[PDB]
């Protein structure tokens, strides 16, 4: 199977610099031209950097050309991408992917990694803030209720959020991220059980917005 | 640098029925494209090379054509899980242009939302700030209108709206409408609702509470 995983950015300040590093098994990697493509926040992907399947050939855009520089550990089965004067408009998710056309076509994109979030912001980090938010009738009389967690102030935008340890899925709805007056982030995780099954499962969401080094449990108490 | 155009974007068809996307070169790219389905998360899949030739372990369903501007990426049979963003990438340039990103949505049958009011907490009532959330949970389509009332009073110019990307499962969109509002402005108000209005709603029915009552 092949495995092309992008492993981890995060936030930078404008004109800082990051390393990201891309990482591929199931497949010989010392035989394809591996490359990385950037995506903006709902726009479009646009290729980045591409490099050889011999590593003596790196091929820039038009922008980044400069900026950040591709790299490849064919011994150790790896790419890396390292980011130097990052602009504003860097704020993508980046993505890589093996490219073989082969001999009968040009350049197509066989498999994507994962693809992590590097953002520029002149903002800093900020931990968040989770409430639990649950109603003001525990007897509702319908069958179908619901509850959360409000994940009220955070930042950069990435913060996995599950229920019951990760038991918990039919009715679990996170919330996209949503932009504040303040600059904040927020979202909220929602989960839709049975009004009988108020005390038959132990409610509790497990945040963690792993930039700020955090991670915040909460059982949906009253 | 050539620049691909995709025509439109809110492709919303039916299931079973084709759904048929565009993608215009500026230039021209001669049989020379690719077709791609990023569902919502997961990073995109390839689907036609060659722009004809279906990539295998994709179905049939995607059958591919065109050449130099006119490409149409088809779906003669269109399901739940076929609710994805598309994309189209030329290959004739050495670098690789992409499009707009065509969204099709799952056209269902119109079900109602299962509407919840949510009173803010005491850990954040400690900070000040106070949030009410009204969650609209699960219905069709997208195209709906949440309304607030803090003592009948509409709270106008303030709600922040969230919309969960169309479900699996069942083809549904869920909505959160997060109302920010200080301590003390809350303190002075008891009524609290959010009012509802939508396609399956004979009425619109609003689920309300007030500040005391608990």
């Known amino acids: 199977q092949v495995q092309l995983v992008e492993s981890g950015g995060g936030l930078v300040q404008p004109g800082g610099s990051l390393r990201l590093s891309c990482a591929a098994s199931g497949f010989t990697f010392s035989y394809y031209d591996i490359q990385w493509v950037r995506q903006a926040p709902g726009k479009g992907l646009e290729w980045v950097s591409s490099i050889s399947p011999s590593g003596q050939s790196t091929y820039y855009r038009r922008e980044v050309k400069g900026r950040f520089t591709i790299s490849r550990d064919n011994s150790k089965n790896t790419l890396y991408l390292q980011m130097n004067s990052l602009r504003a408009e860097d704020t993508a998710v980046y993505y890589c992917?093996?490219?073989?056309?082969?001999?009968?076509?040009?350049?197509?994109?066989?498999?994507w990694g994962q693809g992590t979030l590097v953002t520029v912001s002149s903002a800093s980090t900020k931990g968040p803030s989770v409430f639990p938010l649950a109603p003001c009738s525990r007897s509702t009389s319908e069958s179908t209720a619901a509850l959360g967690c409000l994940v009220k102030d955070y930042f950069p935008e990435p913060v996995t959020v599950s229920w019951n340890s990760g038991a918990l899925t039919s009715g679990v709805h996170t919330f996209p991220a949503v932009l504040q007056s303040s600059g904040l982030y927020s979202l909220s995780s929602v989960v839709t059980v049975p009004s009988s099954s108020l005390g038959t499962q132990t409610y509790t969401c497990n945040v963690d917005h792993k930039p700020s080094n955090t991670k915040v449990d909460k059982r949906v108490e009253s | 640098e050539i620049v691909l155009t995709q025509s439109p974007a809110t492709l919303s068809v039916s299931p079973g029925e084709r759904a048929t996307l565009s993608c215009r070169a500026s230039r021209s790219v001669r049989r020379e494209l690719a077709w791609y389905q990023q569902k919502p998360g997961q990073a995109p899949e390839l689907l036609i090379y060659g722009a004809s030739t279906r990539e295998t372990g994709i179905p049939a369903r995607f059958s591919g054509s065109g050449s130099g501007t006119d490409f149409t990426l088809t779906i003669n049979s269109l399901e739940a899980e076929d609710a994805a963003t598309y994309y189209c990438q030329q290959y004739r340039d050495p670098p690789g242009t992409f499009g707009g990103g065509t969204k099709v949505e799952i056209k269902r049958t119109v079900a109602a939302p299962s509407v919840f009011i949510f009173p803010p907490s005491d850990e954040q009532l400690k900070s000040g700030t106070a949030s009410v959330v009204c969650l609209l949970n699960n219905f069709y389509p997208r195209e709906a209108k949440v309304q607030w009332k803090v003592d009948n009073a509409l709270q106008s110019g303030n709600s922040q709206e969230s919309v969960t990307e169309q479900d699996s499962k069942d083809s549904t969109y869920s909505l959160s409408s997060t109302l920010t509002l200080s301590k003390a402005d809350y303190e002075k108000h008891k009524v609290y609702a959010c009012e509802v209005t939508h396609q399956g709603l004979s009425s619109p029915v609003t689920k309300s509470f007030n500040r005391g009552e608990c």
């Open positions: 992917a093996r490219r073989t056309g082969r001999e009968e076509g040009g350049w197509i994109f066989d498999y």
